[PDB]
Design a protein around this ligand. Structure first.
Ligand SMILES: COc1cc(N2CCC(N3CCN(C)CC3)CC2)c(NC(=O)C(Cl)Cl)cc1Nc1ncc(Cl)c(Nc2ccccc2P(C)(C)=O)n1
Length: 301
């Protein structure tokens, strides 16, 4: 019920210069690029997104909605929406995450530092979510894929297409149909489309399991239609090899059926925080020019 005094910044399409095409597909097309606030003497590196290329006026609904959310978040572990450009096709100008998705990164570099990296990432993602929990925001699509790498030491949560902001008396979002990422999703949601902050904890568990397994596919082989029952019988993802019981037990708590006996993000920070002060006790792995980054180009507005 608090007034969302966020500022939406509209950018002249001339101020920035597309440069290459990082990925394309469902989202549409993301372009590595560069933004030069005029008469400002900084060059800010950016991703520039547009959903494919067809008019589809229902699409701009969705773009302008993710832009609404991102405009309303500001945390060191959540993606910064920089502004939009009101071209025929509407574009989201976002901060460039130079190292790509965490999913890729862990896959590409299975020579990944032990918990120092792994458990540090676990802390930073819990901080990210706990913030959205303050902001009464429910991500509904937490996954290794949707976490970007600014540096190997600093990650941020992205992709707010499915995000929903709870009203001041909304425990759950009661969603319509659609294609949903079934393997990352609480059961109460897979069955009753009831999404919650605690449902987001479950997706945090699958994400952690993704990182601990260096990129494995949840329930690989299984067909998503099965998942609902599989998890109803009592089944869960396995204990990843490098995982001590201490870590694996935390993952398993995020996957309880009663969502109120699942742990809270503020606790997840604390616990992983503790573990990351003695990383090797918990994770066992063999061998352990005018540019300004956006995190320093603070509001000219
Ligand atoms: C500029 O660095 C990036 C590089 C890449 N690669 C991946 C491999 C990479 N190799 C070099 C660096 N290390 C060491 C790893 C390997 C080079 C090219 C990607 N692509 C992916 O990691 C997959 Cl997704 Cl192809 C991204 C970015 N950067 C970026 N920044 C902001 C956003 Cl908002 C974004 N979104 C975005 C971008 C693409 C697709 C989808 C999405 P969305 C809207 C759904 O989040 N990307």
């Amino acid at each position: 019920e608090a007034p969302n005094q966020a500022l939406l910044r509209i950018l002249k399409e001339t101020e920035f210069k597309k440069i290459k095409v990082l990925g394309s597909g469902a989202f549409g097309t993301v372009y590595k690029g560069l933004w030069i606030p005029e008469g400002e003497k900084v060059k800010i590196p950016v991703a520039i997104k547009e959903l494919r290329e067809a008019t589809s006026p229902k699409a701009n609904k969705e773009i302008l909605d993710e832009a609404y959310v991102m405009a309303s978040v500001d945390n060191p572990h959540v993606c910064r929406l920089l502004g939009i450009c009101l071209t025929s096709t509407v574009q989201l100008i976002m901060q460039l995450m130079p190292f790509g998705s965490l999913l890729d990164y862990v896959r590409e570099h299975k020579d990944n530092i032990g918990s120092q990296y792994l458990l540090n990432w676990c802390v930073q993602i819990a901080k990210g979510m706990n913030y959205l929990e303050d902001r009464r925001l429910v991500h509904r699509d937490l996954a290794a894929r949707n976490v970007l790498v600014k540096t190997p030491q600093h990650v941020k949560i992205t992709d707010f297409g499915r995000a929903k902001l709870l009203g001041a008396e909304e425990k759950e979002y009661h969603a319509e149909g659609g294609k949903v990422p079934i393997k990352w999703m609480a059961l109460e949601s897979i069955l009753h489309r009831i999404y919650t902050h605690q449902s987001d904890v479950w997706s945090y568990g699958v994400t952690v399991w993704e990182l601990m397994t260096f990129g494995s596919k949840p329930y690989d082989g299984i067909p998503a239609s099965e998942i609902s029952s599989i998890l109803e019988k009592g089944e869960r993802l396995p204990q990843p090899p490098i995982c001590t019981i201490d870590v694996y037990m935390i993952m398993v708590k995020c996957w309880m059926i009663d969502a109120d006996s699942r742990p809270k993000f503020r606790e997840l920070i604390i616990e992983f925080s503790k573990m990351a002060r003695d990383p090797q006790r918990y994770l066992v792995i063999q061998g352990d020019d005018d540019v300004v980054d956006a995190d320093e180009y603070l509001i000219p507005q």
